[PDB]
């Protein structure tokens, strides 16, 4: 039925990286128990709340399909409770810090000794053995360390962070691959393992394409598909011309194609008003003829100066400039449709508002409405992977310690035993 | 031990999304066989080559740990081999445009019949059932459809694509999650499933925080941590203030924090000539004091209009402007160290040049030196996940059809018959 039914997960994570990971596992049928700080809880609960004292959307959108229990781990009894839980867990996940978990006394060594089958998964800022093996890291810093910032934005501008969670959720998804990889291994050894993912590494993996460019640039001195390859097109804030004669590290290429064919972000009707009135237009080599037909430029079909990638290198930006001219009186969708008739890869820039109420995404289960009778329903992103014989069942995020009792019981303890922990405040 | 040792992968993928997925599976021990078009193969082979007649870096960096076989699938004998091969595979991965595999006659249905244990995994532009179900999609088109573009960049600029491969490799890694999940299911039902990942959904999943903001905006009409929230700081076309008045869709916030505490991208010594001479300075709350200690500024710690998130969302950009002045005569690293003391979340913008040759990343195996005796060594990104009892062994990319015979024999074909497939031009 569900990929991870019967997999018990001890979630010590907070914020985004770890939470995203365990939430996805939970979507695949895993039993996720989130161990939070007594009284405070995951710091995302009171982060940018849309309504006072109600768990914020930051928390609910990253902690669905999870149960919560409040436990003070800097406590002797708190550390014992873990042992009862670690012995029942299939996998433990945590962020905290380089050695936050270690200082609590639960080291990889002690854990294996407690449960030879358990898997320990962690998200770090930098890989163990890295000069910055100690630093605390947040989203944007990871983007900077991984090469995404340096290669995102414009040549006449500063390194730009991406709206997408390249360092956080991306790290989470990568950690998921590690955990599942561990699970597949265990089937062959009946022995658990420790898996770790550094945010810098998760970012570098998505920036693979740029490491390709750095080498091409070192070997040839030029990146022909970049705007800077066009003579006198790009300039710095002081008007100095930018060419590859002086570029030694992969530059920002604005809205150039990256790993796709050459492309550019083109304005559409109303761009002055609607910040998202644009389409991404691609000029694939195998499709020049079609482009020429669409823009009424038959003379360009046979012109050696226009019919090959190499020939377009010195005028590509002028061509996009002209193409853009044909979209002046059309909206994103009209342009997207018009291009579709020609089979040209063209897509509109979708605004969050549009994405949130899009029929398609809700129909396929990517944008899901979570039934939350306590905080009120809210939208969330479902499972990006669709299966032929499995449908995720997404349920609301837990209230702080909502299942502390429910859990302590499942362990075996009883009413009286529990009550003591509540008093001593170990729970 | 190798997580996927013994897993046979029938790889029909090309370009980036699918290849990234199979290459990583191979990095984890999987036996990957790449089926390519005859004479030409994966279009990445001759895509921006650095040396004529030599597989490009685009191809080698996404196809290590794989064997290559050529096959004309629009051939009767070609289709017999695939069927024969699907019988020996655990999972088949594909990323040809919508319905391409079906037209070849290999739909999910027929595939299940040929082998009940085989998992069919694929990447597409949009989810099955989506209004844009049948559109061909490249990297940035998916970044636009998934909402990353609309939320990346600046308010006074256009939608901006990320240098990171939000659409391709990101979908590839998500497809890997789906495949491992399907393998965990088969370990129980004893049968394979069909798994798919839409690039739009892969992107949406990393843009989760923006779906958070869109709801926050609808419910409250404002985003306090966004640049537009500050009293006339950002301006539109005409010289006039911006605010969440008339802003109904999550806007672009330049270099704001996003999934973490506030912050900005600050210039450092030489930023005029060094495009990557910047650091990212995060102003968290639980250390506002320390910040005041470095920025030698104690008048804030005791100024309510300064020591709180709410008591600062009106002059955020003013502090940043300030702090940047203190970085004026220092380099990324100097600024990072001078800050690291106060355990502050400050990080340098790493350039591709620095990352490609960072000794640290190569020690931990994140950036790996691939021994390629045929083409010459090249760098690549290794496995982002580190395992306590497993180290990947990265092998060079295959030449077109380099392993055709070797594989046609693993099936059972004889020395002569193979010579016929070559003659008939199916191989
Ligand atoms: C959030 C972060 C970036 C900085 O965090 P922070 O505010 O310093 O909080 P920490 O997690 O480091 O915890 C501080 C201390 O409280 C402790 N603590 C956490 N939960 C606790 C609990 N329930 N009971 C008792 N102590 C607890 C930690 O173990 C740590 O102890 P230590 O000082 O002995 O190391 C940090 O978690 C980190 O560097 N995490 C990895 C980052 C990551 O994954 N970032 C992507 C975020 S989505
Ligand atoms: C590259 C892409 C974007 C546009 O591709 P394209 O140049 O049109 O090529 P296609 O993959 O669609 O293939 C064209 C045809 O050749 C066929 N073909 C592919 N390999 C073949 C082979 N070895 N032998 C015979 N025919 C073959 C395809 O099956 C298809 O047939 P059809 O016209 O009957 O549908 C397309 O693959 C696509 O939309 N892919 C999903 C996109 C994706 O994952 N993008 C992220 C990129 S990393």
From Swiss-Prot, chains A, B:
Binding locations of CoA: 14-17, 37, 71-74, 95-97, 103, 136-139
Effect noted on mutating residue 47 to P: Little change in the affinity binding and catalytic efficiency. It exhibits substrate inhibition with oxalate. It does not display major structural changes
InterPro entries reported for this sequence: CoA-transferase_III_domain, CoA-Trfase_fam_III, CoA-Trfase_III_dom3_sf, CoA-Trfase_III_dom_1_sf, Formyl_CoA_transfer
Active site positions, chain numbering: 168
UniProt feature coiled coil, ranges: none
Stated consequence of mutating residue 258 to A: 2.5-fold decrease of the catalytic effiency
Summary of pH dependence: Optimum pH is between 6.5 and 7.5.
Gene3D superfamilies the record matches: Crotonobetainyl-coa:carnitine coa-transferase, domain 1, formyl-coa transferase, domain 3
Ranges that cross the membrane: none
Outcome of substituting residue 168 to S: Loss of CoA-transferase activity
Any GO molecular function: formyl-CoA transferase activity
Outcome, altering residue 168 to E: Loss of CoA-transferase activity
GO process terms (BP): oxalate catabolic process
Listed pathway(s): Metabolic intermediate degradation; oxalate degradation; CO(2) and formate from oxalate: step 1/2
Any single Pfam family the record assigns to this protein: CoA_transf_3
Amino-acid biosynthesis listed as a keyword: no
Quaternary organization: Homodimer.
HAMAP family, A to Z: Formyl_CoA_transfer
Chain's role: Involved in the catabolism of oxalate and in the adapatation to low pH via the induction of the oxalate-dependent acid tolerance response (ATR). Essential enzyme for the bacterium survival, as it relies on oxalic acid as its sole source of energy. Catalyzes the transfer of the CoA moiety from formyl-CoA to oxalate. It can also use succinate as acceptor.
Family the entry assigns: Belongs to the CoA-transferase III family. Frc subfamily.
The protein's name in its UniProt record: Formyl-CoA:oxalate CoA-transferase
Gene: frc
